[PDB]
Curated annotation (Swiss-Prot), chains A, B:
One of its GO terms (biological process) is deoxyribonucleotide biosynthetic process. The record marks Y685, Y686 as: Important for electron transfer. Provides the precursors necessary for DNA synthesis. Catalyzes the biosynthesis of deoxyribonucleotides from the corresponding ribonucleotides. R1E contains the binding sites for both substrates and allosteric effectors and carries out the actual reduction of the ribonucleotide. The lineage of its organism: Bacteria, Pseudomonadati, Pseudomonadota, Gammaproteobacteria, Enterobacterales. Under complex allosteric control mediated by deoxynucleoside triphosphates and ATP binding. The type of nucleotide bound at the specificity site determines substrate preference. It seems probable that ATP makes the enzyme reduce CDP and UDP, dGTP favors ADP reduction and dTTP favors GDP reduction. Lacks the N-terminal activity site. Pfam families: Ribonuc_red_lgC, Ribonuc_red_lgN, RNR_N. Disulfide bonds join C171-C408. Substrate binds at T154, S170, C171, G199, N379, L380, C381, S382, E383, P581, T582, G583, S584, I585. It comes from Salmonella typhimurium (strain LT2 / SGSC1412 / ATCC 700720). This is Ribonucleoside-diphosphate reductase 2 subunit alpha. The keyword Oxidoreductase applies. PANTHER family: RIBONUCLEOSIDE-DIPHOSPHATE REDUCTASE 2 SUBUNIT ALPHA, RIBONUCLEOSIDE-DIPHOSPHATE REDUCTASE LARGE CHAIN. Keywords: Allosteric enzyme, ATP-binding, Deoxyribonucleotide synthesis, Disulfide bond, Nucleotide-binding, Oxidoreductase. The record marks C171, C408 as: Important for hydrogen atom transfer.
Amino acid sequence: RVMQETMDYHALNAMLNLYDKAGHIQFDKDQQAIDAFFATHVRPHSVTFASQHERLGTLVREGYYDDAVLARYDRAFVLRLFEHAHASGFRFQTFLGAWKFYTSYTLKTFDGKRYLEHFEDRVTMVALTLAQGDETLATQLTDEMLSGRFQPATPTFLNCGKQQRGELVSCFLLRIEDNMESIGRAVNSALQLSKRGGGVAFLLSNLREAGAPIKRIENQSSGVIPVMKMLEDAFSYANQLGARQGAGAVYLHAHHPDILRFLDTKRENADEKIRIKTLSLGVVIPDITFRLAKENAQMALFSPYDIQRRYGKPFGDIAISERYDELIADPHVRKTYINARDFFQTLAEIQFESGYPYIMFEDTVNRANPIAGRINMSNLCSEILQVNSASRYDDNLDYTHIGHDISCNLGSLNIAHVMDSPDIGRTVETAIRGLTAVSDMSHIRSVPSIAAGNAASHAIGLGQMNLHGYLAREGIAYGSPEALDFTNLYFYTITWHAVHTSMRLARERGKTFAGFAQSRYASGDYFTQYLQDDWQPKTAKVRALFARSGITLPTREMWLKLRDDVMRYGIYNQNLQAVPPTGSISYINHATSSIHPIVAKIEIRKEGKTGRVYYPAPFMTNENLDMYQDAYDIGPEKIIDTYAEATRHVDQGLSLTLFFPDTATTRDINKAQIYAWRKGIKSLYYIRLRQL
Amino acid sequence: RVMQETMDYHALNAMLNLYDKAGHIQFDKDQQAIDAFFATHVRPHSVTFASQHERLGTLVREGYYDDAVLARYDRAFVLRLFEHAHASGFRFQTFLGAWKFYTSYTLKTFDGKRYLEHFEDRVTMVALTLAQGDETLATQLTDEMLSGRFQPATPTFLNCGKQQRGELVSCFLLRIEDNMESIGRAVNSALQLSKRGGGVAFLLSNLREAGAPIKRIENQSSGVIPVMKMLEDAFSYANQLGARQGAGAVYLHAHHPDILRFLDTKRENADEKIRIKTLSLGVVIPDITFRLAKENAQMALFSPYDIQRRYGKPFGDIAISERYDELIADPHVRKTYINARDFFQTLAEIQFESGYPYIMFEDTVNRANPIAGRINMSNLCSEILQVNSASRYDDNLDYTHIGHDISCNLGSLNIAHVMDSPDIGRTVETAIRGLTAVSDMSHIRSVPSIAAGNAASHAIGLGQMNLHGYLAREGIAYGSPEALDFTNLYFYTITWHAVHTSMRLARERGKTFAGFAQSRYASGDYFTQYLQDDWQPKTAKVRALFARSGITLPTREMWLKLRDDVMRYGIYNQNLQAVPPTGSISYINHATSSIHPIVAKIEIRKEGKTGRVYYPAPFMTNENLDMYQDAYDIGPEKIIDTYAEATRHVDQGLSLTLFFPDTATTRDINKAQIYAWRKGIKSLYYIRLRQL
Ligand SMILES: Nc1ncnc2c1ncn2[C@H]1C[C@H](O)[C@@H](COP(=O)(O)OP(=O)(O)OP(=O)(O)O)O1
Ligand SMILES: Nc1ncnc2c1ncn2[C@H]1C[C@H](O)[C@@H](COP(=O)(O)OP(=O)(O)OP(=O)(O)O)O1
Ligand SMILES: [Mg+2]
Ligand SMILES: [Mg+2]
């Protein structure tokens, strides 16, 4: 206090990376870094206005905040809230969560020399923004975000309410039809989306294979690679401001003739002009492929060219599994053959050397998918999963028929914090509303097919973070039967409330998502799954928690009751949850990324002027370390295990990474994937091999 | 005859490449190759129908010819012509002109096993096609083409009237505005155009320089290179059917900040990702730049970014020359500086090692340009030169305002053959009509801005071939004062008739090209140039020729008379002539490519199953070899000289190549270019260094 010492919060931070003769960490040194931070850097560079009122005036007047948002409430309420917010007694819990938010989130002055916002402000404008002028909502979003219960996606949190601003949404999925126009559109769409920082993934699977015909003259199509090449260069050119390298991804169906040339753009010892250095790869794999590789058979690759001709649909749209045999019989459909086993072999080697081919288990997916149509691709994070539909052009690239593409608006709940306010239902409801708002205000001008999609589907991505964090606090162990029990039941109870909320919006707004009638929501089967049993706290400790919390587990009475509202009223969103990884927000929200064990006790980031910055995990103390085992230490099985439990309920997907030791073998990898597959998992993200 | 010997017309052809103890060529061995050709390969594989009538029926019925063309005339006339044609007694003059036309032009059966057309047929359908049902026209085009007087562009000759067919036009010029949309459009437009074999050149000059701002935040634009990269990959991907490698070109103004990074994509000892292997480069150079380099000064490169901001126009549109000083004064316009001398130095080294940077003498050009607006770029052959105008987009790439871009439809006259039918005026008129037709029927769907352009401008490219051929026949010598005299007067007389014809169409059709009123055609100055004198056969031999031909040289009476019709009636075409090189047609038409000395006595091509194919030049005999000196032997001056003479009259441009010995020095080159510049030349094509 008064005339204190040690103002190096970077050093203080560092202390978090020392072990005492007894293998304990000085957690407190971190806390000190915070104090020092604010003390020596936050406050002195934070602008302080006479009153809130004068503050906005200024912020509006010099074009920082957007007067358009404020204009939907009576200024006094806009003043009451800024006050509520600042009086809720929020502190940051870590020297980085603070450091993160002020070096990358909080609004600064155009000249970069002064902070103009603090968390509450940010929370506030976000709330105001999404609330769209509905005051009680606005309040609640404020509350939920301040408590730590909710955490909207970065794009949103970062931009809501500012004047100079990006858009509120950031990952995108486009499809490509088999013709020049659709291609030019793709290349274009990439340019436009990327210029504004978006992640875009394209579906290559419909493109005619290398060696296919064009205008009826044999051996002419040149495959997909020269198209990756373009997307590639597009992305590399139209990076976002303040970054080199955009972020693109492509997915190709595994039974597609170019699949090998496809994987081959990643094998380092290669050729030139055939080398893709910044696209992410994803492979879709149907079950048969496993069945094949199992009996060491031959995979048959079918021509999209031919398929289209003979079936009136594009490769990307038919059901390979259900038509494998039929297809091998149709002599009007050319076939090539490769050794499944050698395929998965190739797959794994690449994953080993570069982390990728994302994997999307086509069959598991479509089969659990409550929505009409098939799902043929995924996001750059492999967690979005939704039907899409083809778009058609006029010779001049003008659309003649606008299909539907997928944009994705996410946010997450910090499990811990939710389990802590007995009023779970409110928590879920708000979030859903919040998220839905993101959608409603979204209107991507430059890719008509995306805008159409959103508008039609109102699709959102409610997701979760902090699983480990929680379990740990409650002294349960990642992976444990208890854990499993917990995660199943929780995602169980969350799901009940979101459908319920979406059921509500449906009613409130007089409409539903397009195509609802065809859904499994319309005819009720969606619920069959919840009408049997299984919904009974296996472990004692788990039943416990839920009570010491006041959370009531949805009961057959509730489901049966919910099922009738839907069939009578429908829901507003075509898709509720999705569990992405949780980038740097986590550090702000103080969580453990997503639902997967903690990558380290003291996480280290290559950031800031010191070189690095250390992040101790939530609730962790010298008296509980033994509940913090690395994901590496926990290992694949356990992770694959948790995510499944979450999969019987999540209607989209969950980014799942497997952590392996640097001595793992492709077979090792390969097994894991199999476990994953047999186990229900919808998709697989990355395989990380531990490294420095 | 009856039971003859030696049927190897490839061998016979070869004999053309032997010199006898006295340095004479057996020209006759070639003629024999022809006879053998037809004898052993043409006829036996040429389909012969019972009558013409049954023939079309078939050809229509199996979808070879296009019934739509025939449907505009009474079948009997369509029968009368096929007859006229076949009775005009046309033979080919060379074993390759035949060989060329049947291996690349004449219609064959879908399965490639039989010829279905012969020249006359082809001439005929072309005539029919262009004639658009006007019978006397149709006849004439037939006549002119059969005589050798006219030779429409390859795309046209090749496709007119067929069912399965490409378009009738093939080089294209697009501009790019400084913003993502315009860029995506460019990349797209490239894709679409190229897929159908088009040559496209883009104007890069408006793009913001490497290091310019974006959304107001310093140092961010990444220049033009990543855009060349895209175009590059586009072209490489969407080659035409039966070819690898599309054909793209870019032009950049020499006073543009990226000019050096620009040339640098061609210096072989380079880096990767910055290496452009299939785009053609073109540089625009205004006069000052010479003035600069002369007094070894400093070139100042101005920011397009800034220019736009301060002048409300894009770099690509202002007059650098006229605003050089003004610009260096405006501190609101950033400047970089480079050593002019070192610039031209760089230029030449590249040209030396790779033939390019085309050069377009901005100033000469705009200054001679009779049409409103500036000209800022050129074609992949550097001979088209026309005003263009910016296009504007809506966020979705939909045009909100369609500008004008340039497409180009050419054809040429074989000088010789023209000088041979005293009725020059008919010859010119037809051609113009023929060409105009190409335009009228043209409607490029996929790049709105091109279609708009054409429709507005009706711009055509009448051009010439066989200059050497002629002069030689008449024992004049390439380059000679006589020659010069001849080429000036001829292009002089041709010009009179085309304006006249365009003046006629104007009247016949009740309209003119858009913007005519602003032209120098409207106010008459166009003619001032022809109202003084100069128009008087300097050489005696030249006056001679024109008489022994019956050609009357336009007289001050005619010009004065023509000038009044225009000011009263206007013209239909915004642009009449352009003298491109003459690819493989020449060999068919039997000419010397364009107006520039013959690249060899016996030209050799890497074509056909033998390896090569030998092409002896027109009118050449053992008793006149001394009138056939290589372009290498003639040398730059002389060539630069001829082309000028042609430039006081050609309203667009003339592809000019300089042939140099393999010991020439960049200074050597550099001088030539200067001569060219001081001499009026509008643009410079390639520099060829003799090689094997
Ligand atoms: N000209 C081309 N050059 C390179 N690739 C091409 C070309 N044309 C088509 N492709 C590839 C890209 C698409 O996957 C597919 C279809 O393109 P598209 O324009 O629809 O062809 P098309 O209609 O002319 O031929 P088709 O009759 O075979 O469909 O062909
Ligand atoms: N996001 C980007 N990434 C890479 N290059 C870009 C990006 N945005 C623009 N450029 C370059 C390409 C064009 O030459 C030029 C203008 O693009 P454009 O979309 O018109 O920019 P802008 O309107 O957002 O910014 P400005 O306000 O500076 O014009 O900027
Ligand atoms: Mg097609
Ligand atoms: Mg702009």
